[PDB]
Design a protein that fits this description.
heterodimer, A: alpha/beta, Rossmann fold, 7-stranded mixed sheet, B: alpha+beta, Dna Ligase, domain 1, 7-stranded antiparallel sheet, 4-stranded antiparallel sheet, 14 helices, binds magnesium ion, ATP-citrate synthase (chain B)
Chain lengths: 320, 424
Amino acid sequence: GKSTTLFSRHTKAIVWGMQTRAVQGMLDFDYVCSRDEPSVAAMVYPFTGDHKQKFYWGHKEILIPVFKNMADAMRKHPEVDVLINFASLRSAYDSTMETMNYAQIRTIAIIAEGIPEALTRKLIKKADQKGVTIIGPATVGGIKPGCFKIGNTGGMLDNILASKLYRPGSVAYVSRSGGMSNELNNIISRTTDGVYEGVAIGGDRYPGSTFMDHVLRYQDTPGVKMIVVLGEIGGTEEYKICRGIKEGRLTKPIVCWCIGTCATMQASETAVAKNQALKEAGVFVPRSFDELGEIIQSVYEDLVANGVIVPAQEVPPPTV
Amino acid sequence: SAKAISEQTGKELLYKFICTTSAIQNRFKYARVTPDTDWARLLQDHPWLLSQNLVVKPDQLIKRRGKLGLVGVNLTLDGVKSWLKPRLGQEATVGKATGFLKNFLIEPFVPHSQAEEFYVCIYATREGDYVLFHHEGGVDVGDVDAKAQKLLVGVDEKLNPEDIKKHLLVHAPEDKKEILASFISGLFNFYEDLYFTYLEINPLVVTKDGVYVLDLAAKVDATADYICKVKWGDIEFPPPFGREAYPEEAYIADLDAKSGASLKLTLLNPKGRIWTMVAGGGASVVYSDTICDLGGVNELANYGEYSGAPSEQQTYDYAKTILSLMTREKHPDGKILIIGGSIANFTNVAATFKGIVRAIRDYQGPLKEHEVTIFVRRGGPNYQEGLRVMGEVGKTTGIPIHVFGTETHMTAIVGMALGHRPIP
Ligand SMILES: [Mg+2]
């Protein structure tokens, strides 16, 4: 089965590809989050032979193994349950399919854009078969403050600190766009107690995991008190959210705004009709993106006033 | 993404690559005609144009050509020329699209009865590819989607020929089931092999002499080029039927093709006073929404984006194209340039803004003359440096430039620009 919890303070992951700057960012993030240990246990790359790579766990220097063969990495690091796949697009499909032969991997982030849709349908099919959650393709990934950050998600430490992504808040969110997810980090940190977990499902026609997949996880995560979805013209994904609320499956406050209202350049698929349907279903929908932060704030304050959210105490972050 | 191909491209690929025992007729019998066509050499190249009567029609991604009377049927090479005089180069309107009819396909006329027309379509969904058949095809097919037999070929499944015969073809004439079934099997292998996502033949004609593909519409998954290049060759992806692309759009397209970054530009109203240059695909939709929400739809000049970590030079080339486009005619109320964006994860905002700054400096003269005011809001790696150099180029050039950071709600600058709220 697909897991409800994908990441935690103890997550260890394998990164496939040659991406030193990305790994160092994750470790820097791991450090300001006051994790006990680095979140990247090893790397995989068939284009080179085994070896080690140098990174910094705070001021302390450490070594991260790089394996030529995925098996060696899996075998030597069975504590790993996540793979971040930076494979270039000629390698993304085979490598992702191979990863799924190793059952310790419960979550795969696929970074590459440009994977043919027919290939992605096959990845989805196997993933669903194995109970593996896929985030992407064509995504920067996502972020769980205090716990784990996928690759470049959240940019530089400057942004991690400004948006307080180094410690959990009560607000979870999902969107297609990695650019807008970082904006959501910002909007949410200025209007609430901060992001609990954020996922960018990517822009491909068939994403490995959908808005509803994550909304379900969030609904089932006690730490999440409040859910933000940034929806979009095209397809009928957001109706699953209407049905979910009506059938009693979804009960937490959901804020949603679907972009693409200005499609004046099927009727039920427009942002306008989806916004309206969501609003009628009980979703908190702003009158425009311009008012999204306002509605998030209003829904938050009401959760505070009635005890559902207890804003924790700010604790400055480690060295940096 | 999936992209439409011309009927001629689709037919060529089909004639070249379909593997079927079912005899397909008139392979490669088609001639393309434009307003530049040399009719002497066209005939010397397609001598078959004289052997029999013809059918001529536009091949520009227009649907329902028959029902809308855009097809000359059963004509001589002369009757085709005569049919084309009034039309070639002339405007036509279909739905709410208006454009010039400038690309035509001539093929042999195939005499056949109504009962020899059929419907086939294949198209992709998340759960696999649906194969459609109806035993009545052509113009009067009607609501084919509600009527056709449908068979889902699941992800990584095989299309079983007995399913074709026993489910899809249940209503087909019994003496045509074997040939139709052979054709569909081959059609699906071709669809899968050349990474199609949509392939419709309406009508498919089957006579005593074999199978004729009279009408074809198709899309392929363009990202599959690294796989299908050996088979596709230099495949072209036409725009929808409508206006022709402006030279600047074509330029930005060529820029796009030469980068991993996404460089997009479409002109809605080249005379509008409201111009955007947004980083982020999501952000660009949001800014467009906001402008329309605040009443500016008729002054919205363009939509598009420069996304995915473009270099300074690419960003310079993109920006100077917009700067040029907005200094062609003065507007009585001056103009607005919205340089907005979400907060980048990896894009070096300092490098991109350096390119934008170089552009503003190169067009500073006309920018003051056209009374352009610039609003800037951006976040991302090194964004503070980027915002600084944007403010600098403002003071330096005398062009009014208001810069904002992540403290300013992303769309707030749109209200400021339009005078719906004050500039802080
Ligand atoms: Mg490109």
